[PDB]
Design an enzyme around this catalytic site. Sequence first.
Site, mmCIF file in Angstrom:
data_model
loop_
_atom_site.group_PDB
_atom_site.id
_atom_site.type_symbol
_atom_site.label_atom_id
_atom_site.label_comp_id
_atom_site.label_asym_id
_atom_site.label_seq_id
_atom_site.Cartn_x
_atom_site.Cartn_y
_atom_site.Cartn_z
ATOM 1 N N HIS A 1 0.802 -1.235 0.000
ATOM 2 C CA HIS A 1 0.000 0.000 0.000
ATOM 3 C C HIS A 1 0.822 1.265 0.000
ATOM 4 C CE1 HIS A 1 1.021 0.031 4.261
ATOM 5 N NE2 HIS A 1 0.911 -1.293 4.131
ATOM 6 N N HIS B 1 -1.928 3.549 5.650
ATOM 7 C CA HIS B 1 -2.509 3.164 4.363
ATOM 8 C C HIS B 1 -3.113 4.432 3.736
ATOM 9 C CE1 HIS B 1 -4.713 1.215 1.252
ATOM 10 N NE2 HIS B 1 -4.527 -0.028 1.696
ATOM 11 N N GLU C 1 4.745 -5.368 0.606
ATOM 12 C CA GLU C 1 4.642 -6.547 1.453
ATOM 13 C C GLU C 1 3.967 -7.672 0.740
ATOM 14 O OE1 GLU C 1 2.218 -6.054 5.029
ATOM 15 O OE2 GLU C 1 1.301 -4.265 4.131
ATOM 16 N N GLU D 1 8.381 -7.492 4.357
ATOM 17 C CA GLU D 1 7.924 -6.163 3.987
ATOM 18 C C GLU D 1 9.034 -5.144 4.083
ATOM 19 O OE1 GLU D 1 4.902 -4.684 6.682
ATOM 20 O OE2 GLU D 1 4.075 -3.426 5.089
HETATM 21 C C1 HZE Z 1 -6.503 -4.650 7.431
HETATM 22 C C2 HZE Z 1 -5.337 -4.374 6.576
HETATM 23 C C3 HZE Z 1 -4.378 -5.508 6.532
HETATM 24 O O1 HZE Z 1 -4.633 -3.282 7.151
HETATM 25 C C4 HZE Z 1 -5.056 -2.001 6.968
HETATM 26 C C5 HZE Z 1 -6.172 -1.687 6.222
HETATM 27 C C6 HZE Z 1 -6.591 -0.367 6.091
HETATM 28 N N1 HZE Z 1 -7.642 -0.037 5.261
HETATM 29 C C7 HZE Z 1 -8.233 1.296 5.350
HETATM 30 C C8 HZE Z 1 -8.990 1.611 4.088
HETATM 31 N N2 HZE Z 1 -10.013 0.630 3.885
HETATM 32 C C9 HZE Z 1 -9.428 -0.658 3.724
HETATM 33 C C10 HZE Z 1 -8.655 -1.041 4.958
HETATM 34 C C11 HZE Z 1 -5.873 0.619 6.749
HETATM 35 C C12 HZE Z 1 -4.743 0.306 7.477
HETATM 36 C C13 HZE Z 1 -4.307 -1.009 7.603
HETATM 37 C C14 HZE Z 1 -3.104 -1.318 8.447
HETATM 38 C C15 HZE Z 1 -1.853 -1.747 8.048
HETATM 39 C C16 HZE Z 1 -1.282 -2.081 6.742
HETATM 40 N N3 HZE Z 1 -2.072 -1.943 5.696
HETATM 41 O O2 HZE Z 1 -0.151 -2.472 6.655
HETATM 42 N N4 HZE Z 1 -1.036 -1.892 9.151
HETATM 43 C C17 HZE Z 1 -1.736 -1.560 10.287
HETATM 44 C C18 HZE Z 1 -1.342 -1.543 11.616
HETATM 45 C C19 HZE Z 1 -2.278 -1.176 12.549
HETATM 46 F F1 HZE Z 1 -1.951 -1.197 13.844
HETATM 47 C C20 HZE Z 1 -3.554 -0.821 12.181
HETATM 48 F F2 HZE Z 1 -4.433 -0.464 13.118
HETATM 49 C C21 HZE Z 1 -3.942 -0.826 10.873
HETATM 50 C C22 HZE Z 1 -3.037 -1.202 9.899
HETATM 51 MN MN MN Z 2 1.995 -2.657 5.587
HETATM 52 MN MN MN Z 3 3.689 -3.963 8.271
#
Ligand code: HZE
Ligand code: MN
Ligand code: MN
Length: 362
Positions: free
Chosen positions: A221, A229, A251, A346
């Site tokens: 992302h 994100h 990742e 990642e």
């Molecule tokens: C479920 C997914 C893996 O992680 C996400 C999806 C989102 N999205 C928003 C927009 N709508 C779709 C979901 C946002 C952020 C994340 C996210 C990631 C990541 N992507 O690496 N790492 C994290 C660590 C955290 F402690 C957290 F609380 C959240 C994250």
């Molecule tokens: Mn990530």
């Molecule tokens: Mn990560």
Amino acid sequence: VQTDPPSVPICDLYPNGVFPKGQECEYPPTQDGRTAAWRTTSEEKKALDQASEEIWNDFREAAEAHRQVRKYVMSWIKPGMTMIEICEKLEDCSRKLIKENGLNAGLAFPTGCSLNNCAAHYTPNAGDTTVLQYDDICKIDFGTHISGRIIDCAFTVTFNPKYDTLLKAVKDATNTGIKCAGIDVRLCDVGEAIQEVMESYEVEIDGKTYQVKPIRNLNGHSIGQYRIHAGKTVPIVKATRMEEGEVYAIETFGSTGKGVVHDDMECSHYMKNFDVGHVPIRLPRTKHLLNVINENFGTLAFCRRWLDRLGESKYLMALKNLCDLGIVDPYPPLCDIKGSYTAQFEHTILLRPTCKEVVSRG
Ligand SMILES: CC(C)Oc1cc(N2CCNCC2)ccc1-c1c(C(N)=O)[nH]c2cc(F)c(F)cc12
Ligand SMILES: [Mn+2]
Ligand SMILES: [Mn+2]
């Protein structure tokens, strides 16, 4: 010089305030075969790159802290340790090296230490008695930031060599993604390349054979300031393009299961919804918790352990209220089928006007 164990902040190790660059790469050639080499010597691209030097310097400071923390983690992570002890030892080091200072420098998100079938978002809550086992496959995923310039970087820890080829498959798919990424490169193209590499691997674990499957609903992302994100997704299975100045978390996740994750177990990860503006709250416990979140985390993710560390208690109903109001979003553990094995690698990459920098590279 850095002490053993590390305790000297990265800031003090670089008195000039110039932090080390990550791996610098030329961008991939086009479909026609045209090289991107011209970007490195272009005076216009160099001007645009120099204009954001302060931003890259912040990512570099956060990346150096990340490298030193993970080198430290690798020297002591052992079965027998509780997941709480692993996370607290890692976070204590991370806080010291990043020189934690409110919202200006600190931890970008909780330390993930997801095990076996659980691919991501597992961190122990208070009272979790889980102990790391010899046969476990542990995904260490942690983040550091300087001025909201986030390093999202993860690796997989194992003790039993039976998982060696599974880890190799995922590292190769992640390195492929890093290699394929670039300015004007399609996100779908990076995704197809990752899949082709991961699926070329076959593994044998306890007499059972498997073709390594990428986790189709776990993806790379874009990264925004104080935004883990930023809205652009890099798939890891088979037409939006990457843009100049963007930052990406590349990742990949490999699995011996279905190659799909579902929410499971007790939730530990939470994060304010970036799109939600000011919401007046009268409910005193809910109001207090949101103020605690706004002051300590803002739009960065947090966990229940971090609320306990802040001296907060009896906040679970207040936290549920924030989730039901849409102000905070829960990020529960993501698991494949019981009995399956998942691995992750990642890195954070900067799409600089002149070159592609794997800023988190070891
Ligand atoms: C479920 C997914 C893996 O992680 C996400 C999806 C989102 N999205 C928003 C927009 N709508 C779709 C979901 C946002 C952020 C994340 C996210 C990631 C990541 N992507 O690496 N790492 C994290 C660590 C955290 F402690 C957290 F609380 C959240 C994250
Ligand atoms: Mn990530
Ligand atoms: Mn990560």
